[PDB]
Each structure stands twice: as C-alpha cells, then as structure tokens.
Design a protein around this ligand. Sequence first.
Ligand SMILES: [O-][O-]
Ligand SMILES: [O-][O-]
Ligand SMILES: [O-][O-]
Ligand SMILES: [O-][O-]
Ligand SMILES: [O-][O-]
Ligand SMILES: [O-][O-]
Ligand SMILES: [O-][O-]
Ligand SMILES: [O-][O-]
Ligand SMILES: [Cl-]
Ligand SMILES: [Cl-]
Ligand SMILES: [Cl-]
Ligand SMILES: [Cl-]
Ligand SMILES: [Fe+3]
Ligand SMILES: [Fe+3]
Ligand SMILES: [Fe+3]
Ligand SMILES: [Fe+3]
Ligand SMILES: [Fe+3]
Ligand SMILES: [Fe+3]
Ligand SMILES: [Fe+3]
Ligand SMILES: [Fe+3]
Ligand SMILES: [Fe+3]
Ligand SMILES: [Fe+3]
Ligand SMILES: [Fe+3]
Ligand SMILES: [Fe+3]
Ligand SMILES: [Fe+3]
Ligand SMILES: [Fe+3]
Ligand SMILES: [Fe+3]
Ligand SMILES: [Fe+3]
Lengths: 171, 171, 171, 171
Amino acid sequence: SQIRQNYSTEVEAAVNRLVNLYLRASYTYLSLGFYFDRDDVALEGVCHFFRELAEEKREGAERLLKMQNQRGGRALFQDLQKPSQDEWGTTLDAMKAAIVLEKSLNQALLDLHALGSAQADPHLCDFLESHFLDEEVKLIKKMGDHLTNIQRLVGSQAGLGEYLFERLTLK
Amino acid sequence: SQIRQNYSTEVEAAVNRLVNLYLRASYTYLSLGFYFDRDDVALEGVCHFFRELAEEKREGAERLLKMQNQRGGRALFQDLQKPSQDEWGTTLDAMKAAIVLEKSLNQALLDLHALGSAQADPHLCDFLESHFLDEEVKLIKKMGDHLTNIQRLVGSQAGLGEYLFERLTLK
Amino acid sequence: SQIRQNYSTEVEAAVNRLVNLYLRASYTYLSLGFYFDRDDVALEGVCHFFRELAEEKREGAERLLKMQNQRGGRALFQDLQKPSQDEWGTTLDAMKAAIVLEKSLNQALLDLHALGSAQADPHLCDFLESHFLDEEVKLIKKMGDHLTNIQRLVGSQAGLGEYLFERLTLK
Amino acid sequence: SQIRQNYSTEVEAAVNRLVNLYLRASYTYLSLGFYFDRDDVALEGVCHFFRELAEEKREGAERLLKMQNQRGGRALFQDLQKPSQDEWGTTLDAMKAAIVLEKSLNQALLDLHALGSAQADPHLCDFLESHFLDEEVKLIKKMGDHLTNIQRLVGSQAGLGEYLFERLTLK
Ligand SMILES: [O-][O-]
Ligand SMILES: [O-][O-]
Ligand SMILES: [O-][O-]
Ligand SMILES: [O-][O-]
Ligand SMILES: [O-][O-]
Ligand SMILES: [O-][O-]
Ligand SMILES: [O-][O-]
Ligand SMILES: [O-][O-]
Ligand SMILES: [Cl-]
Ligand SMILES: [Cl-]
Ligand SMILES: [Cl-]
Ligand SMILES: [Cl-]
Ligand SMILES: [Fe+3]
Ligand SMILES: [Fe+3]
Ligand SMILES: [Fe+3]
Ligand SMILES: [Fe+3]
Ligand SMILES: [Fe+3]
Ligand SMILES: [Fe+3]
Ligand SMILES: [Fe+3]
Ligand SMILES: [Fe+3]
Ligand SMILES: [Fe+3]
Ligand SMILES: [Fe+3]
Ligand SMILES: [Fe+3]
Ligand SMILES: [Fe+3]
Ligand SMILES: [Fe+3]
Ligand SMILES: [Fe+3]
Ligand SMILES: [Fe+3]
Ligand SMILES: [Fe+3]
C-alpha cells in the first residue's frame, strides 16, 4: 500500500476482529428489538431502545471500516455468528445481557488500545479515544442505571414494574 | 472603613458565619446530588433536585458576601466541613436530611435578624427579609410536601414508590 | 459495581483528591474575587476575573464527579481547607498566587494522567486530555500574559498601573 | 384627616425634615455638577455623575412627599439652605464631600426608622426599607469605590489621574 505508514499487521487484524464484534453486537440488538415487538411481549419502548443500539453498533463497524481503509489496511469479513439466544425473557434479563455484551465490546476496545500503545500507533489510540471509549463508558453507565431502576421496580409485581419502566423511562 | 455606618462587629461576624453555613449547605447538596447519580441509585430527578439546591445555596452565600462588602464588613473565610454522610440512603432519608439542613439555615437567619433588630440595623433586617426568609419558608414547605408524598408512596413496595415519585413529581 | 471496568482503586482515590483540589481552587478564587470588591480595593475587573475562575473550577470538580460516577467509582468528599490568605495585596500579588495555584492543579492533573497511563486506563487519559490539560495550559498562558502586563505597568506609579490594567485589559 | 391612621405627629414632622434634607442634597449636587462643567474644571463625566445625583435626591423628596400625603400628614416646606461651598476643588475633594453628604442622609433615614419603630409604625419602616435604605447603602459603596480609585490615581501626577478617572470610569 502506497499510503500505509506505522500500521502493523497485528493492529490491522485486530481491527477486522473488532468490526466482526460490532456487527455481531448489532445483530444481537436487532434480535433483542424484534423480540420485544412480539405480540406476546409488546414493550415498544424496549424494542425502540434496542433497535437504536443495533444502529449505533452498525455505525461503529462502518467507522472502523472507514478507518481501516484510511490507514491502508484491508477489510476482511467473517461469518456473523447468530445471537446467543432466540428469546430474551424479561426486560431485566435483556438489559443484563446487553450490559454483558457492551462490557465485552469495551474490553475488546481496551485490548486494541493496549496493542496500539505497544505498537506505538498514536493515530489508532486517538481514534479509539475520540470515537468509541467515551461512548462505551456513557452507554454502560446508562444501562447500569436502567438495570437499577428495573430491579427497584420488579421487587413486588414484576408485570406492573416492567410496564411502568417502559412507559416512564423508555422513549 | 470610609463607608461603614451602623454595622456592628457582632453582625459582621454573624454574617461571616452565615456564609460558611450556606457554603456548607451547598456542599452537602452537591454530595446528595452525585449520590443519586450513582449507577446503583440512579434517580436522576432526585439528582437534579439536589444539584439545583447546591447552586441556590452557593448564590445565597455570594449575596451575603456582596452585602458584607456593601456595608464595609470584611469577608472572613473558614474551612468547609465535609457533609455529615457519605451515603444518603433512600429518597426519603435524603429529603428528611435536607429538611433538617434547611431548618437549621432558617434558624441561623432568624438568629441574625434578631441580632440585627437588637443592634437597630434596619438595612440588615430588610436584606434578610427581602432575599432569604421568604425563600427559606417557600423551600421548606416544598420539602415537607415532597416528604408527605414520598411517605404516602413508600408504604407498600418502597421501590415502586421511589421510582414513581422521581418520574412524576421531580423535573 | 455492575458497571466498573478497568478502573483502579488508585485512580478512584486520586480522582476524589483532584475533586477536593478543584473545590479548594474554586474557594480560593471566591475569596480573591470578593477581596477586590472591597470598597478599599475596588478593582471590579479583577473581581469579575476571579469570580469567573471560581465558577470554572467548580465546573471542573463537577465534571470529575460526573466521570467518577460514569466509571463506577464512589465520590468521597473531604473538608475544604480555607484559602491560604485572608487579604490578597495588589493585583500583582493576587495574579502571582493564582498562577501558583493553577500550576499546582496542572501538576495534579499530570500526576493523574501518569497514574492512568501506569494503570493502562485510556479512558481516564483521554478524559483529562480532552477536558482539563488544554484548558489549564491556555489559562496559565493567559495569567502569565497578565502578570507580564501588570509588571510592565507597575514600574513607576504602581497605583496608576493597577487602575489602567483593570480598565483596559480586564472585562 | 379622614384617612390618618397610626401616623404620629413626630413621624410627620421628621418626614418634613427629611424632605428638606433631600432637596438640600439635590441642591448641593446641582452646584457640584455645574462646578465640574466650568471651562476651567471641565470634567464632563464628573458633571454628569453629580447631575444624575441631583435628580435622584429630588425624586427621593417627591416619594417622601407622596408618602406624607398617603398617610394624611401635611407637607410643610422650609427655606433651602445653599450648598456649603461655592467651589468644590478636585474630583477627590468633591467625592469626599458627596460621601459625607450621603452618610448624613443615611443617618437621618436610620433615625426616622428608629422613630417609626418606637412609634410602632410598620408602614413607615417598610417604606424606608423598600425605597431608601438599600439605595443609600448601594450608593455609598459606589462612592467609596470611586474614592479608592481617585486616591489610587492621584498619587503621582494628580492631573493625569483625574483625567483618566473621568474618562475610564465615569459615563
Ligand atoms: O449518526 O451518529
Ligand atoms: O445517535 O448517535
Ligand atoms: O439566579 O437566581
Ligand atoms: O432559580 O432561582
Ligand atoms: O460552561 O462551560
Ligand atoms: O466559560 O467556559
Ligand atoms: O426614575 O427612578
Ligand atoms: O435612575 O434611577
Ligand atoms: Cl512504516
Ligand atoms: Cl456609625
Ligand atoms: Cl476489570
Ligand atoms: Cl389611630
Ligand atoms: Fe434511529
Ligand atoms: Fe443513532
Ligand atoms: Fe450514532
Ligand atoms: Fe445515526
Ligand atoms: Fe440550574
Ligand atoms: Fe437556580
Ligand atoms: Fe437563584
Ligand atoms: Fe441561578
Ligand atoms: Fe459567569
Ligand atoms: Fe464560565
Ligand atoms: Fe466553563
Ligand atoms: Fe459556565
Ligand atoms: Fe437622568
Ligand atoms: Fe435617575
Ligand atoms: Fe431614580
Ligand atoms: Fe429618573
């Protein structure tokens, strides 16, 4: 590549893996969204929340792919593994699973920053810092908040709690 | 002081103490606010309510400091003692503590008015009347109202009550 | 904490100390501001300059407290030590003291970045970089500029120099 | 008087004396204003400052006269004694004399409040508090500030200091 400069094959490879993680997160959230749109679940605000996350994660992957090209790396695509579940249980189950997922994405971002740092690739480190690390931290805080409110509510009368959360907190 | 007129050293000293009480109230409310912003508490409307009070109390102190200068007194600052608690429990615990705090501020205002009256300092008395006494009374009424509503709600299912209060009453 | 990830107890503790430094800086600037508002000092542009800094430092502390919560740390508040002086002398004395203060805040920021770097906490490093390091550098440059102009002016006729600076440079 | 209620002849009499003090202050300020408008003094910003005060004091007297009528007292007018000087010296001399004058007006207001208090006349006390006491305190603070700045400036080169004050502080 005529443009490639200070961009290691290790970072290129990790970037392609991170794109796959993001597309997979996006796929997971798509399945979460349409689960809550079922007539027997019917929590529209939960559906909108996860469908918005499907979009965000897809955008994350595209920004990674745009960056890969800017550096002269080569995008390599792999199979996208289907989500870990077909049914997601209650809002509480679903938000717990979403937090697990975001934490693993965040861990992958931190591992990539550490690689970039080891490879002395400051553009990589800045790119993650600017576009991904802060947004992951903000998102995980939001989910933890949600989880605290769902839990507070589904003490007595789980059904009432679940309806109230979706109506009064979710968009 | 070329400007000082009818302004006793007793009133000057009490004014400096009242500034310290207000800054301390402000500090207490800052700690209340960020406690309710924790991911394991997550009552954003309670956080906004106390963060607004932190600001109000800070402004109260500045108005007192501006007045002290207008009269030719000398501002003297002391250590600000940290809030009485690190964790504030439920919304109910927190609102009870806030009411205790406001009542003690109000008592300090009343003691200063009584001093001003004893010293025949009408400008002091009017300044407190105009800017502090009415606002304290209105605020304490608001808190008592809140406390009544929290209590009414946290009879059965304390968690549901706490969520509903924060969603339907707080901003 | 359900959300805490890659956030060491060392960084949490240093963050709480930095909040205390900022609140203390804010307190110092409040005292600087009202000193220059005295009828026997009466340099309104110097008062506005330090009162603006009191506000900025308070905001710095709140951003740190918001961040602490975003990461799952626990805010811990301590006593705020009163400012180092009760009277601040001339504009020159005061600006020198302000520069000392800002330099020590900047040093605390640099020590926290070095800790974050040692702990491999990129979100911390980026957060300081983005919101604090640049603003401290810009502010310290501004103060040094001011100090040079005050000094140039208070060569002959210190009183005239001090009035002219406040009228023609300060807002 | 069909309307007179709780309005003692002592307060009525003191009110008429206070009107005379205000009209006399107004007259003093008129003479201060036109002195600084002389071609051999020529400090237009000082002239505007005192001419504005002549107007304020005249308004103070009219508010007192309107109040006297509202209570069923009878306005009684006396001779207005000419100002204490024909020439007012420097800006510094003039501002010192203005501060003396305002302090004596303020003292007369405080004596009238004390009378009103002794006579249990709350409407009188409130009327002074609302319209006169605060404005006197604010004005005296402003004058003291001015005096500090004039003094700071007329250390070396009294003429330069006097010109700069009038240009950069006065309207
Ligand atoms: O669209 O971000
Ligand atoms: O929505 O970004
Ligand atoms: O702002 O009151
Ligand atoms: O808000 O005052
Ligand atoms: O407000 O920064
Ligand atoms: O002002 O930031
Ligand atoms: O016109 O006051
Ligand atoms: O001008 O009142
Ligand atoms: Cl290379
Ligand atoms: Cl006195
Ligand atoms: Cl971890
Ligand atoms: Cl009667
Ligand atoms: Fe969308
Ligand atoms: Fe979006
Ligand atoms: Fe987006
Ligand atoms: Fe979008
Ligand atoms: Fe606000
Ligand atoms: Fe406010
Ligand atoms: Fe306010
Ligand atoms: Fe405000
Ligand atoms: Fe401001
Ligand atoms: Fe600001
Ligand atoms: Fe700001
Ligand atoms: Fe601001
Ligand atoms: Fe006018
Ligand atoms: Fe006017
Ligand atoms: Fe007026
Ligand atoms: Fe007018």
